[PDB]
């Protein structure tokens, strides 16, 4: 039996699936620990900038879970994620402990820019700038890749890099109330918020887990953007992004929300 995680029916994501919208030859790079494989996920391909970890198979699991919220398949298994026929990258760019580089984030988003991705998700953060990393979601962006990232589980009122910078579409975590969640940063710069509060998704060794963060939250965004790019793909990274907050459902101050929690149902209508 499938079950559809709490998250994904606040999205409003089964709405967009019943209109056919699914994320079918939309390209999602998932920068993360990897993406191990499961039943209940399709990995088209990707690539490894960890030193030393070649594959791109996720020792850690954090990579996985996000990448099922992202597009766990449409079966009678498992979850479901919000874009399920979405065209699945690894890209790992963090270690096992869960933790990576610049160097390495930066490499990732040249590989997705360089590859094609319409989406890249960045369920991770830095607490300190980086004109690397900025010039890397710059340059992806120049080639096309809509990058969504992580606003930080600090709990302060700025959120982490690289979602602090323009180019990247930054997400906060909401809770089941439809409030901010304690440990969601916010503030500048702020874009969306998403589900990020008792999250199951795919986990490895063909398993699920509940989850808590802002890196939750993401993925749903990146998922959202999927179909809004299967419905226009024509549209570019600016288009998808901007109709993705000109359809959330607003909550409150855009200090705290940004625009709002994304609504797939809205952003396909
Ligand atoms: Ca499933
Ligand atoms: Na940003």
Same mark, same amino acid.
């Given at each position: ?17 019943? /209109? ?7 390209? !999602? ?14 990995? *088209? ?43 699945? %990258? ?46 890397? !979601? ?25 979602? /602090? %910078? ?13 409030? *901010?969640?304690?440990?969601?940063? %916010? ?20 398993? %699920? ?18 179909? !809004? ?11 998808? *992004? ?26 396909? *209508?």
């Amino acid at each position: 039996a499938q079950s559809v995680p709490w998250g994904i029916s606040r999205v409003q994501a089964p709405a967009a699936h019943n /209109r056919g919208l699914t994320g079918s030859g939309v390209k !999602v790079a998932v920068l993360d620990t990897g993406i191990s494989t499961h039943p209940d996920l399709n990995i *088209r391909g990707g690539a490894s900038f960890v030193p030393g970890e070649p594959s791109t198979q996720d020792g850690n699991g954090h990579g996985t879970h996000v990448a099922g919220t992202i597009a766990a398949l449409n079966n009678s298994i498992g979850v479901l994620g919000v874009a399920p026929s979405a065209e699945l %990258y690894a890209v790992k760019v963090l270690g096992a402990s869960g933790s990576g580089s610049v160097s390495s984030i930066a490499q990732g988003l040249e590989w997705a820019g360089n590859n094609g991705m319409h989406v890249a998700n960045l369920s991770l953060g830095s607490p300190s700038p980086s004109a690397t990393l900025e010039q890397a !979601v710059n340059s992806a962006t120049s080639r096309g890749v809509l990058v969504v990232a992580a606003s930080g589980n600090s709990g302060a009122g700025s959120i982490s890099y690289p979602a /602090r %910078y323009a180019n990247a579409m930054a997400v906060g975590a909401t809770d089941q109330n439809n409030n *901010r969640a304690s440990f969601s940063q %916010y503030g500048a710069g702020l874009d969306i918020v998403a589900p990020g509060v008792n999250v199951q998704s795919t986990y490895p060794g063909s398993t %699920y887990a509940s989850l808590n963060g802002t890196s939750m939250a993401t993925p749903h965004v990146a998922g959202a953007a999927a179909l !809004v790019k299967q419905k226009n793909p024509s549209w570019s990274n600016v288009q998808i *992004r901007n109709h993705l907050k000109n359809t959330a459902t607003s909550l409150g101050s855009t200090n705290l929300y940004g625009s709002g929690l994304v609504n797939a149902e809205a952003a396909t *209508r």
